[PDB]
Amino acid sequence: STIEEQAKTFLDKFNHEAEDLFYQSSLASWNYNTNITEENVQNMNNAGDKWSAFLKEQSTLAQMYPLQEIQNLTVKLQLQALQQNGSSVLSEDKSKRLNTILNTMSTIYSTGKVCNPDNPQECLLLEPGLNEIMANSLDYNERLWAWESWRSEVGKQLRPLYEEYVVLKNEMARANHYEDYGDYWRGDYEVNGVDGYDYSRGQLIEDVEHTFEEIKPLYEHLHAYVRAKLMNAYPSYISPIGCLPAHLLGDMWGRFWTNLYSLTVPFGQKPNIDVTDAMVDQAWDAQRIFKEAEKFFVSVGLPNMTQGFWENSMLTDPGNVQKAVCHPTAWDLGKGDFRILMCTKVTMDDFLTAHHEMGHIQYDMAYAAQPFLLRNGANEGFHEAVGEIMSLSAATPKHLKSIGLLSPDFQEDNETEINFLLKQALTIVGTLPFTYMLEKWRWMVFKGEIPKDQWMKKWWEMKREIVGVVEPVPHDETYCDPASLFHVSNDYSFIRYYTRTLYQFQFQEALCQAAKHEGPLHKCDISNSTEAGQKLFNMLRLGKSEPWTLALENVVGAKNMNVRPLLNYFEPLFTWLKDQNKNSFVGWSTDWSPYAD
Amino acid sequence: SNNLDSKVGGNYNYRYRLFRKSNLKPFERDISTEIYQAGSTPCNGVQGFNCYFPLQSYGFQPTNGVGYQPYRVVVLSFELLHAPATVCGPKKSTNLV
């Protein structure tokens, strides 16, 4: 009689009908990625539209069950996502024009290219063409030509398409009773209905801004060290208290500094840990690479992989006849069908990536018993965070020596680990400032605090203050830097990468306390320890059915994000960088510019 | 049964009753297809708000997980009534001397 019984009935029949259409929609995309054919391209659109229109048809009946009469927390969470109308709230024109802007901006990104200034005939596309050249390019002009010329025909041309994306998406948030479109993404962390665990959407701006203050002393030292090694190349453009060029970050957008690890090696007289030459002599293939990782999850207590998982895996690309995307991805369809599509070579990274790609599959097995709408991570940062903790355990010399990759007589000391922390710091400490910088800028533009003319004026003004990077060539409001980015042009969440660093480290410190490991954190290894797996498995099966604030307390015992695990794991590196920076100036100034003298 | 029942594209021939006004009694079989009424809103056999179709088809494909793979179950009900007994176990019939 009560609306509760009617709501639970609508939710029971929704999981069955949605599981069949969702599985066929994901299955169609699998055959399209594994094999490029005219039949798979159409099946992805038909199966994709059938499932896309399914939620639109169910959303009409979901708004007829108010959440005020529902006293069940698990019931409101399932209807919380269905209550949203998506693009239905937008006008007929604004709703159809939105997909045209997303498809137009996404097409220019893949079709965009920059012709070689020295070779006008040869014109290389950004990916891989422009992303690979900028990685190993040490030239100042060669890197500036592709970096400066890209945003000229892209950043400038995407400005009118980006303006519509800002106005169109705002109309959707306002129709949803949201302060703005920026608050739309913060809704993933929204927590309500539980006394004391409530997490407001606006509290994210204060947490990300409060936690970033503690990372400054660690990043300032890491930035001063990188500027000292590269200061001998161009002392005029690189000031001691200034900032590093924007095109010298090692790649197009300067997201990860790992490419600079070669020249930033503190000690070049000592060997480095690599499994490439060790795996070659062992004569291992893609078939035994995943098998070795499957035994790791069993040592911690996690169930093994189903027979269909290993049988349906795609270990390589059979030439150009049948082509697939080598980009590692973990595909979860449904009905217990788990698969991974990746191109498997013999490298030290593929071994670490195998644990990451398998972490997503292993993570999907815990909450697989939850309802369709209840199957998901507690937030957008837990997806890749659970997979990083698995890779961090394999990179430790203790895990490598266990399976026999690294020689048992390999000497492990400060000089050996100090070089390892620097490699992980560039990929970790390097993305944090860039993530908080770009993510915070989008929130200000969407909120309306930055006029359209100040988009670029505030972009570089906040860049030197956050990441300490200055533009070699000044730009006007015509250019759009985020327009060229992959996540910004594809309408994907860019904040999930910032929180992933804080979440992956919290679990690393908590899981090692259960296994009773002593010494530095980077020396911890969760293998052979079945006590840490039982504690992490509890939250793995919860998913988003429970507030992420509550599930996070059962693991690390914290009700919010904390930077403490970031300082301890990087503590040994901070102590060494502090001494090497005594001869230099720690930090940078925002009053220095390469074109302003 | 994944090697027989499950086929490419899915097999909807095997369905089930998702909703019922109550719980079935022991050894009871009801094939009634009458629409299920969740609330007090009249249905009259026309699908709509608070009106659903109870029978649902089992998705069957060879790519499904082993847990959800269809299993053919044969349930033998042993009941001893007042009537004489007939069915018995096998025999022996050893050698003769």
XYZ file of C-alpha atoms in Angstrom, chain A residues 12-546:
535
model
C 13.427 -5.301 -8.587
C 12.050 -5.408 -12.141
C 14.491 -2.684 -13.233
C 17.627 -4.680 -12.394
C 16.540 -7.610 -14.571
C 15.508 -5.581 -17.622
C 18.529 -3.284 -17.259
C 20.982 -6.171 -16.843
C 19.974 -7.709 -20.184
C 20.152 -4.483 -22.200
C 23.290 -3.257 -20.416
C 25.111 -6.540 -21.069
C 24.286 -6.464 -24.786
C 25.314 -2.802 -25.014
C 28.712 -3.495 -23.440
C 29.096 -6.721 -25.429
C 28.564 -4.785 -28.664
C 31.367 -2.383 -27.735
C 33.655 -5.349 -27.036
C 33.284 -6.842 -30.517
C 33.799 -3.333 -31.918
C 37.056 -2.712 -30.040
C 38.453 -6.225 -30.510
C 37.539 -6.221 -34.216
C 36.838 -3.239 -36.475
C 34.039 -4.137 -38.892
C 30.942 -2.585 -40.427
C 28.764 -4.956 -38.385
C 30.321 -4.080 -35.021
C 30.175 -0.322 -35.658
C 26.412 -0.533 -36.194
C 25.817 -2.979 -33.336
C 27.468 -0.527 -30.938
C 25.091 2.249 -32.024
C 21.963 0.073 -31.961
C 22.850 -1.600 -28.660
C 24.087 1.730 -27.304
C 20.911 3.593 -28.247
C 18.647 0.797 -26.993
C 20.269 1.011 -23.554
C 20.519 4.812 -23.649
C 16.795 5.102 -24.387
C 16.052 2.505 -21.695
C 17.089 4.810 -18.849
C 15.163 7.642 -20.513
C 12.019 5.489 -20.468
C 12.593 4.341 -16.878
C 13.403 7.877 -15.705
C 9.837 8.947 -16.508
C 8.486 6.336 -14.079
C 11.239 6.994 -11.515
C 10.148 10.590 -10.850
C 6.710 9.282 -9.796
C 8.104 7.768 -6.554
C 9.108 10.627 -4.230
C 12.003 9.899 -1.884
C 10.327 11.650 1.065
C 8.119 8.617 1.790
C 11.002 6.116 1.473
C 12.666 5.333 4.806
C 15.140 2.829 3.312
C 18.637 4.114 2.571
C 19.442 1.446 -0.025
C 16.174 2.205 -1.831
C 16.742 5.958 -2.149
C 20.279 5.431 -3.462
C 18.976 3.240 -6.290
C 16.282 5.795 -7.165
C 18.704 8.700 -6.656
C 20.359 7.999 -10.013
C 17.104 7.129 -11.792
C 15.452 10.342 -10.579
C 17.854 12.286 -12.806
C 16.449 12.968 -16.278
C 19.863 13.527 -17.864
C 19.462 15.606 -21.015
C 15.652 15.397 -20.892
C 15.521 18.519 -18.714
C 17.249 20.466 -21.494
C 15.279 22.012 -24.338
C 14.732 20.093 -27.569
C 17.297 22.285 -29.330
C 19.751 22.463 -26.423
C 19.392 18.700 -25.944
C 20.149 17.793 -29.567
C 22.808 20.494 -29.987
C 24.678 19.193 -26.924
C 25.513 15.871 -28.583
C 26.667 17.763 -31.682
C 29.144 19.804 -29.625
C 30.504 16.733 -27.829
C 30.869 14.835 -31.108
C 32.376 17.862 -32.866
C 34.912 18.571 -30.113
C 35.793 14.875 -29.831
C 36.261 14.602 -33.604
C 38.647 17.566 -33.834
C 40.702 16.034 -31.016
C 41.296 12.771 -32.885
C 41.483 14.418 -36.321
C 43.582 17.347 -35.093
C 47.189 17.481 -36.248
C 50.131 19.871 -36.546
C 52.150 19.863 -39.761
C 55.924 19.843 -39.365
C 57.199 23.427 -39.819
C 60.372 22.145 -41.493
C 58.451 19.530 -43.541
C 55.108 21.050 -44.599
C 54.317 17.864 -46.537
C 54.521 15.591 -43.484
C 51.654 16.279 -41.063
C 51.543 14.211 -37.870
C 48.444 13.736 -35.736
C 48.584 14.440 -32.009
C 48.106 10.839 -30.852
C 50.395 8.991 -31.156
C 52.277 11.339 -33.457
C 52.450 14.480 -31.331
C 52.421 12.669 -27.973
C 55.383 10.419 -28.820
C 57.635 13.106 -30.316
C 57.176 15.476 -27.369
C 58.149 12.701 -24.938
C 61.775 12.201 -26.021
C 62.260 15.610 -27.678
C 65.004 17.606 -25.941
C 64.879 20.547 -28.366
C 63.590 23.953 -27.294
C 62.244 24.973 -30.711
C 61.111 21.486 -31.744
C 58.986 21.210 -28.597
C 57.708 24.784 -28.941
C 56.579 24.340 -32.557
C 54.253 21.419 -31.809
C 53.222 22.806 -28.409
C 52.520 26.366 -29.578
C 51.028 25.542 -32.989
C 48.595 22.935 -31.627
C 46.480 25.341 -29.563
C 46.500 27.843 -32.445
C 44.256 25.755 -34.712
C 42.782 23.766 -31.798
C 42.572 25.955 -28.704
C 41.435 28.913 -30.800
C 38.987 26.947 -32.959
C 37.589 25.042 -29.961
C 36.831 28.272 -28.073
C 33.430 28.802 -29.772
C 32.631 25.100 -29.369
C 33.728 25.228 -25.721
C 31.573 28.290 -25.008
C 28.467 26.373 -26.087
C 29.586 23.438 -23.937
C 29.666 25.774 -20.928
C 26.246 27.327 -21.566
C 24.567 24.053 -22.553
C 25.820 22.042 -19.572
C 24.826 24.817 -17.154
C 21.191 24.601 -18.270
C 21.215 20.931 -17.249
C 22.512 21.595 -13.729
C 20.013 24.410 -13.153
C 17.143 22.136 -14.201
C 18.468 19.564 -11.699
C 18.370 22.105 -8.832
C 22.172 22.377 -8.795
C 24.065 25.586 -8.075
C 25.964 25.191 -11.364
C 27.529 22.613 -13.664
C 30.678 22.541 -11.535
C 28.646 21.244 -8.598
C 27.284 18.511 -10.884
C 30.545 16.549 -10.762
C 30.913 17.151 -7.016
C 27.625 15.283 -6.543
C 29.507 11.988 -6.799
C 30.934 12.646 -3.323
C 27.577 13.854 -1.969
C 26.591 11.931 1.171
C 23.191 12.349 2.822
C 20.784 10.233 4.854
C 23.238 9.020 7.523
C 23.628 11.003 10.737
C 27.169 12.297 11.203
C 28.510 10.949 7.892
C 26.786 13.603 5.761
C 29.185 15.151 3.239
C 28.143 18.367 1.513
C 28.971 19.017 -2.130
C 30.577 22.378 -1.345
C 32.891 20.745 1.204
C 34.973 19.271 -1.634
C 36.374 22.677 -2.616
C 37.655 23.152 0.939
C 39.089 19.633 1.269
C 40.993 19.709 -2.029
C 42.230 23.211 -1.191
C 43.130 22.325 2.408
C 44.983 19.117 1.517
C 46.919 20.809 -1.299
C 48.518 23.177 1.223
C 50.406 20.286 2.840
C 51.640 19.021 -0.543
C 53.341 22.352 -1.334
C 56.488 21.669 0.762
C 56.883 18.297 -0.967
C 56.199 19.644 -4.468
C 58.304 22.786 -3.994
C 61.356 20.638 -3.241
C 60.565 18.288 -6.132
C 60.215 21.281 -8.469
C 63.455 22.939 -7.343
C 65.358 19.694 -7.948
C 63.978 19.287 -11.476
C 64.829 22.912 -12.299
C 68.424 22.477 -11.102
C 69.229 19.614 -13.480
C 67.657 21.433 -16.445
C 69.084 24.834 -15.458
C 72.368 24.186 -17.286
C 70.584 23.867 -20.639
C 68.942 27.321 -20.739
C 70.028 29.581 -17.858
C 68.510 32.672 -19.499
C 64.930 31.397 -19.786
C 65.160 29.293 -16.598
C 65.498 31.478 -13.487
C 66.579 30.042 -10.115
C 63.515 31.499 -8.362
C 61.405 31.403 -11.540
C 59.351 28.687 -13.196
C 60.117 25.978 -15.730
C 58.930 26.278 -19.347
C 55.508 24.822 -20.074
C 56.666 22.803 -23.100
C 59.605 21.177 -21.263
C 57.393 19.210 -18.844
C 58.183 16.078 -20.892
C 54.899 15.728 -22.800
C 52.188 17.825 -24.439
C 50.180 18.896 -21.377
C 52.811 18.214 -18.708
C 50.541 15.800 -16.848
C 53.251 13.287 -15.882
C 56.954 14.022 -15.408
C 58.027 10.367 -15.703
C 59.564 11.198 -19.090
C 62.096 13.391 -17.248
C 63.231 10.516 -15.007
C 66.102 9.826 -17.421
C 67.872 13.157 -16.875
C 66.671 13.451 -13.257
C 68.306 10.196 -12.079
C 70.073 11.105 -8.808
C 72.647 8.303 -9.168
C 73.669 7.019 -12.587
C 76.485 4.812 -11.294
C 74.081 2.258 -9.791
C 71.820 -0.222 -11.608
C 68.047 0.132 -11.673
C 65.383 -2.521 -11.146
C 64.035 -3.786 -14.475
C 62.209 -7.042 -15.229
C 62.506 -6.663 -19.015
C 65.847 -8.454 -19.356
C 64.894 -10.876 -16.571
C 61.594 -11.903 -18.171
C 63.247 -12.406 -21.572
C 65.678 -14.986 -20.192
C 62.799 -16.615 -18.303
C 60.913 -16.878 -21.630
C 57.495 -15.674 -20.502
C 54.510 -14.740 -22.667
C 51.212 -12.932 -22.163
C 49.599 -16.209 -21.077
C 51.862 -16.611 -18.031
C 51.945 -12.882 -17.218
C 48.331 -12.817 -16.028
C 48.649 -16.259 -14.425
C 51.453 -14.990 -12.183
C 49.294 -12.032 -11.129
C 46.291 -14.258 -10.387
C 48.305 -16.012 -7.666
C 48.903 -12.629 -6.008
C 45.208 -12.001 -5.342
C 44.924 -15.509 -3.886
C 47.734 -14.840 -1.396
C 45.689 -11.989 0.121
C 42.482 -14.055 0.281
C 40.737 -12.685 -2.810
C 39.051 -15.283 -5.048
C 40.798 -16.357 -8.234
C 39.680 -15.589 -11.795
C 36.938 -17.558 -13.521
C 37.785 -19.902 -16.382
C 35.975 -17.717 -18.910
C 38.049 -14.705 -17.867
C 41.418 -16.151 -18.900
C 39.955 -17.895 -21.965
C 38.347 -14.757 -23.434
C 41.303 -12.436 -22.797
C 42.940 -10.649 -25.731
C 46.723 -10.958 -25.470
C 47.763 -9.096 -28.644
C 46.570 -7.541 -31.900
C 46.542 -9.994 -34.841
C 47.897 -7.539 -37.388
C 45.843 -4.985 -39.275
C 43.270 -7.515 -40.531
C 41.652 -7.652 -37.080
C 42.681 -4.561 -35.114
C 41.983 -3.537 -31.523
C 42.837 -0.634 -29.232
C 46.005 -1.315 -27.231
C 44.917 1.162 -24.546
C 44.644 -0.948 -21.361
C 41.053 -1.069 -20.146
C 39.049 -3.264 -17.766
C 35.651 -4.055 -19.301
C 32.866 -5.158 -16.941
C 29.735 -6.225 -18.844
C 27.592 -8.352 -16.549
C 26.313 -11.821 -15.738
C 29.752 -12.734 -14.403
C 31.466 -12.000 -17.735
C 34.806 -10.252 -17.152
C 37.336 -9.475 -19.878
C 40.385 -7.281 -20.463
C 41.528 -5.920 -23.839
C 45.202 -4.947 -23.965
C 48.260 -5.448 -26.159
C 50.727 -7.481 -24.091
C 54.439 -7.013 -24.771
C 57.435 -7.952 -22.618
C 58.255 -4.963 -20.404
C 58.517 -3.984 -16.758
C 55.484 -1.700 -17.142
C 53.188 -4.335 -18.663
C 53.820 -6.513 -15.606
C 52.843 -3.620 -13.335
C 49.943 -2.745 -15.643
C 48.733 -6.357 -15.518
C 48.080 -6.023 -11.783
C 46.297 -2.707 -12.383
C 44.075 -3.992 -15.195
C 43.352 -7.093 -13.108
C 42.642 -4.946 -10.049
C 39.574 -3.491 -11.751
C 38.291 -6.985 -12.562
C 39.117 -8.231 -9.064
C 37.358 -5.159 -7.658
C 34.223 -5.881 -9.708
C 33.987 -9.401 -8.247
C 33.364 -8.240 -4.665
C 30.287 -6.068 -5.282
C 29.016 -8.187 -8.193
C 26.364 -9.526 -5.792
C 24.873 -6.031 -5.453
C 21.955 -4.779 -7.566
C 22.618 -3.395 -11.032
C 22.150 0.213 -9.912
C 24.181 -0.566 -6.767
C 27.173 -1.983 -8.687
C 29.845 0.729 -8.800
C 32.682 2.322 -6.852
C 31.907 4.513 -3.862
C 33.180 7.435 -5.966
C 35.084 8.194 -9.170
C 38.475 7.945 -7.443
C 38.138 4.407 -6.098
C 38.049 2.832 -9.574
C 41.739 3.375 -10.365
C 42.809 3.666 -6.711
C 42.163 0.001 -5.893
C 44.243 -0.946 -8.938
C 47.224 1.224 -8.004
C 47.705 -0.368 -4.574
C 48.193 -3.684 -6.382
C 50.828 -2.253 -8.733
C 52.684 -0.505 -5.905
C 53.103 -3.881 -4.188
C 54.593 -5.480 -7.312
C 57.127 -2.680 -7.866
C 58.663 -3.369 -4.450
C 61.937 -5.344 -4.658
C 60.521 -7.831 -2.137
C 57.718 -8.964 -4.456
C 59.984 -9.184 -7.511
C 62.530 -11.348 -5.682
C 59.729 -13.653 -4.500
C 58.731 -14.873 -7.974
C 62.349 -14.818 -9.163
C 62.430 -11.781 -11.463
C 65.121 -9.899 -9.528
C 68.308 -11.657 -8.484
C 68.304 -12.627 -4.779
C 71.718 -10.979 -4.279
C 70.552 -7.571 -5.538
C 71.694 -4.924 -3.065
C 68.847 -2.793 -1.689
C 69.937 0.416 0.045
C 69.206 4.144 0.129
C 70.859 4.804 -3.239
C 68.669 2.108 -4.806
C 65.366 3.193 -3.241
C 66.000 6.945 -3.534
C 66.063 6.522 -7.315
C 62.821 4.521 -7.163
C 60.926 7.108 -5.105
C 61.849 9.842 -7.590
C 60.362 7.825 -10.457
C 57.103 7.374 -8.540
C 57.123 10.984 -7.317
C 57.058 12.439 -10.837
C 54.041 10.302 -11.758
C 52.343 10.990 -8.405
C 53.579 14.354 -7.131
C 53.612 15.602 -10.720
C 49.930 14.978 -11.443
C 48.634 16.446 -8.164
C 49.404 20.141 -8.875
C 48.302 19.803 -12.503
C 45.099 18.070 -11.377
C 44.153 20.626 -8.719
C 45.123 23.421 -11.121
C 43.013 22.358 -14.106
C 40.115 20.999 -12.041
C 39.885 24.186 -9.971
C 39.910 26.336 -13.119
C 36.908 24.520 -14.600
C 34.957 25.046 -11.372
C 35.612 28.798 -11.522
C 34.710 29.191 -15.207
C 31.516 27.148 -14.869
C 30.574 28.955 -11.646
C 30.803 32.303 -13.451
C 33.604 33.859 -11.389
C 35.925 34.252 -14.410
C 34.601 36.355 -17.323
C 34.969 34.898 -20.801
C 37.832 37.301 -21.557
C 39.800 36.253 -18.451
C 39.729 32.510 -19.221
C 43.347 32.516 -20.403
C 44.402 35.427 -18.180
C 43.416 33.404 -15.104
C 44.707 30.123 -16.566
C 48.394 31.068 -16.619
C 48.030 33.428 -13.648
C 46.927 30.478 -11.507
C 49.382 28.100 -13.207
C 52.571 29.770 -11.970
C 51.074 29.961 -8.469
C 49.974 26.301 -8.385
C 52.303 24.242 -10.591
C 54.850 27.024 -11.130
C 54.789 26.960 -14.936
C 55.008 29.988 -17.232
C 54.050 30.275 -20.897
C 56.896 30.945 -23.359
C 54.509 32.649 -25.812
C 51.757 34.784 -24.222
C 48.221 33.914 -25.299
C 44.984 35.893 -25.399
C 41.459 34.789 -24.472
C 41.043 33.174 -27.909
C 43.140 30.119 -27.044
C 41.657 27.421 -24.810
C 44.144 25.162 -23.035
C 41.666 22.616 -21.572
C 39.952 22.333 -24.966
C 42.886 20.251 -26.234
C 42.949 17.961 -23.187
C 41.480 14.483 -23.571
C 39.274 14.516 -20.469
C 38.145 18.126 -20.943
C 37.086 17.573 -24.561
C 35.434 14.202 -23.845
C 33.376 15.495 -20.882
C 35.013 13.210 -18.316
C 35.692 13.882 -14.647
C 39.143 15.416 -14.152
C 38.917 15.539 -10.341
C 38.964 11.745 -9.934
C 42.725 11.755 -10.575
C 43.480 14.079 -7.646
C 41.578 12.076 -5.023
C 43.042 8.835 -6.403
C 46.459 9.806 -5.021
C 45.143 10.380 -1.492
C 42.975 7.245 -1.482
C 45.612 4.862 -2.855
C 48.106 5.977 -0.197
C 45.624 5.714 2.683
C 44.948 2.071 1.813
C 48.685 1.450 1.412
C 49.305 2.642 4.977
C 46.262 0.857 6.430
C 46.751 -2.462 4.623
C 50.386 -2.621 5.771
C 49.373 -2.155 9.414
C 47.183 -5.262 9.149
C 49.991 -7.345 7.623
C 52.353 -6.157 10.397
C 55.158 -4.949 8.131
C 57.960 -2.847 9.610
C 60.215 -0.254 8.028
C 59.562 2.333 5.326
C 56.222 2.233 3.546
C 57.669 1.662 0.068
C 59.290 -1.503 1.451
C 55.884 -2.918 2.429
C 54.555 -5.873 0.437
C 51.030 -7.254 0.845
C 51.878 -10.618 -0.737
C 51.634 -13.767 1.385
C 49.606 -11.723 3.899
C 46.005 -12.939 4.166
C 45.047 -10.542 6.980
C 45.101 -7.395 4.829
C 42.911 -8.953 2.138
C 40.094 -9.745 4.562
C 39.953 -6.103 5.677
C 39.932 -4.690 2.137
C 37.405 -7.266 0.902
C 34.748 -5.805 3.211
C 34.710 -2.479 1.360
C 35.279 -4.079 -2.054
C 31.848 -5.742 -1.942
C 30.093 -2.611 -0.639
C 30.585 -0.450 -3.726
C 28.501 2.720 -3.760
C 25.582 1.108 -1.901
C 26.984 2.750 1.249
